């Protein structure tokens, strides 16, 4: 999707922690847990143990 | 008059709003084919 | 997006009057431009014609028969309309496999 | 199969065109009879009980008489080709993923709205070949397809390599990439296939379908990546099956309707055709008109069914037997 | 897939995720070096 | 009935290359991670697993013959070390000139032990376990070698290719027929 940057005021990809170390001490992860296709479609996730 | 804001490395096609970077060549979206420079 | 009733496809999936685009009021009108025509008078009809029996009523027995056959028909009959005043109205795009 | 009516129709089969009564022995015959001055007409013929005689056709009163040459009843399996057109790409694109939909319609209920689909999917490579592309979508095809365990698939998918051309190859789920071992494939044929039948139950249907594409980019638009075209069909479904749901209908009639309700109380109904052999067809509707005041019609038809030895050898001789006591001028076929 | 954004013009080589232009070669970094558009 | 060689145990070799779908050569800037999953390391079953790994970043001008030579110190590096309280997998390098001949790796082999620039691959070959007549039973670890995903151009590719060859060493009849004469006493 070239048409729309991801910046990190959404997506919170990289997130401020509170640490010893530092200040502004900062964390990083992300995943992507859902889908949402057009026409009122939408796919989420079911992480089973069995499988 | 056409702003392509953002370079892409990759052996596929990227977008018409993007510059398609392959080892050797720089290609972009002209007239309806890609053109590579140099 | 009915496919009974459309029956060309699309060679990008679906139906091909799902891709037909509508504009059914251009601007606003201040009466109906499209709309259905009735009449005030009762106009649907229905009659039966019969033997000895109907099995539409029920009727065991017949004083006025209409054959000897013993069936029983029935006959029904309407009358109906519709107007559009404007045509330059309403605007519409529609895929080129439609027209023929 | 439960067929419309004329307010009634009559079937009687023919295996052997006796020439008059007392002829008649073995069950299935059928003689033609008429009086000299050719005003009626009926068919005494050897039912599997006895001997029995048509309902009688009046001649003056005689609306059609035709037959049917029985390659008209025999349904043809539809071929598509698929192909990858030279206007988008005559060879598969590096990176792009090929993904092939068949859309049926008229799955399991009875409607257009009941719509089924199944896939093939090939994700292309830089030094693939289009002739090894179409080996990959047949086996992917056959994977998604072919892959039920009850029944016959709902298509067949086949593979034509061009030094053939006439000859197909058969793409199963058992086909392995080892098996195609040819180097110039140059369509996949997805083919109809003929559903299950049982007599008077489950009529004779099919599965029309539709092989859809999905967009693959190449010059930086989504093009669709193949064409679907339909090639004339090289596979019939014979006229046996119809013809034995005809005569189940039809022979209700006359005989029993209660065709197997309460299962040990019933009357059995010994039919005469074979579902393994193609019948000719013949049908003849007249009516019945009364006097002084019951001039309204009572319509009927009568069916006469004879099996066909690609030459029309048994029906043309019921023809010309009829022709010669009638009086009527059947087209022979 | 690596989406490069900004060019950069300096003598000597920028950070691995920006275009490297410098006199007339086009270099950006691919397969672990730069590599000249050309 | 049986001839003495089917119940000899076959060592499930791996031979592992660079993906030449990929490239043929090492690129340059990236990690090169081998994951080795085990799969019964302590206990008897499946879901007891142990990874062990292997890392090698590459730098400019390193040709596959020494990025197969440093792989290999780095596994066993990882693999048979002090700190190993069993005996887990079997390090291998062959060159191309022999082609059949493989080269021991172990963590006393360094760099300046191997000098053939002609390594074509490495081989990955399960171990013996111990064994005491009664109470050992000849068990052995499992394990598939997995790789991580390189940045080749821009897109991220598995690194390698796991190859199951023909097993070449066979642990023989003693240790069974010794155990269970042990068991039929």
């Known amino acids: 999707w070239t048409t729309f940057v991801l910046d990190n005021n959404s997506t919170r990809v990289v997130e401020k922690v509170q640490s010893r170390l530092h200040s502004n001490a900062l964390s990083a992860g992300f995943q992507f847990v859902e889908y949402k296709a057009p026409n009122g479609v939408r796919v989420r996730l079911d992480v089973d143990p069995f499988y | 008059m056409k702003t392509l804001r953002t370079l892409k490395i990759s052996p596929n096609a990227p977008d018409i709003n993007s510059v398609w970077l392959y080892k050797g060549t720089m290609k972009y979206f002209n007239n309806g084919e890609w053109e590579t420079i140099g | 997006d009915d496919p009974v009733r459309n029956k060309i496809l699309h060679p990008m999936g679906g139906v091909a009057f799902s891709y037909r685009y509508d504009i059914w009021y251009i601007g606003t009108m201040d009466q109906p431009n499209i709309f259905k ?64 | 199969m439960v067929i419309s009516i004329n307010q009634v129709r009559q079937l009687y089969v ?86 092939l939909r068949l859309a049926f319609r008229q799955y399991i209920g009875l409607s257009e709205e009941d719509q089924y689909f199944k896939y093939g999917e090939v994700i292309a ?67 109809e296939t003929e559903q299950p039948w049982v007599l008077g139950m489950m009529p004779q249907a099919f599965i029309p379908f539709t092989p859809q594409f999905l967009t693959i980019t190449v010059d930086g638009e989504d093009r669709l990546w193949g064409v679907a075209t339909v090639v004339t069909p090289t596979k019939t479904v014979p006229d046996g099956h119809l013809i034995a749901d005809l005569e189940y209908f039809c022979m209700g009639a006359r005989g029993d309707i209660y065709r197997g309700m309460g299962y040990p109380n019933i009357i059995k109904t010994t039919y005469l055709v074979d579902p393994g052999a193609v019948y000719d067809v013949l049908d003849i509707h007249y009516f019945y008109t009364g006097s002084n005041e019951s001039v309204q019609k009572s319509e009927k038809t009568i069916t006469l069914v004879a099996v066909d030895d690609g030459s029309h050898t048994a029906m043309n001789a019921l023809i010309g037997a009829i022709n010669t006591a009638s009086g009527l001028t059947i087209a022979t076929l």
């Open chain 4, 125 to 191: 490579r830089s030094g693939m070949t289009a002739s090894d592309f179409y080996k990959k979508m047949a086996i992917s095809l056959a994977k998604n397809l072919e892959n039920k365990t009850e029944s016959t698939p709902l298509v067949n998918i086949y593979l034509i390599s061009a030094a053939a051309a006439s000859t197909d190859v058969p793409v199963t789920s058992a086909t392995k990439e080892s098996d195609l071992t040819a180097t110039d494939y140059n369509q996949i044929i997805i083919e």
């Open chain 4, 14 to 99: 023919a295996k052997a065109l006796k020439a008059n009564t007392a002829a008649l022995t073995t069950a299935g015959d059928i003689v033609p009879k008429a009086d000299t001055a050719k005003t009626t007409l009926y068919f005494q013929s050897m039912s599997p009980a006895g001997i029995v005689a048509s309902d009688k056709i009046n001649l003056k009163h005689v609306l059609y008489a035709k037959a049917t040459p029985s390659e008209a009843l025999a349904h043809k399996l539809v071929r598509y080709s698929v192909t990858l057109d030279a206007d988008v790409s005559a060879t598969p694109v590096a990176g792009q993923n090929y993904i």
């Open chain 3, 37 to 100: 025509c009735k009449i005030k008078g009762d106009n649907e009809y229905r009659g039966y014609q019969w033997g000895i029996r109907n099995p539409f009523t029920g009727q065991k027995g017949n004083p006025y028969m209409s054959f000897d056959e013993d069936s029983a028909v029935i006959h029904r009959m309407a009358t109906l309309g519709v107007c559009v005043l404007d045509p330059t109205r309403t605007m519409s795009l529609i895929p080129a496999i439609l027209q023929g």
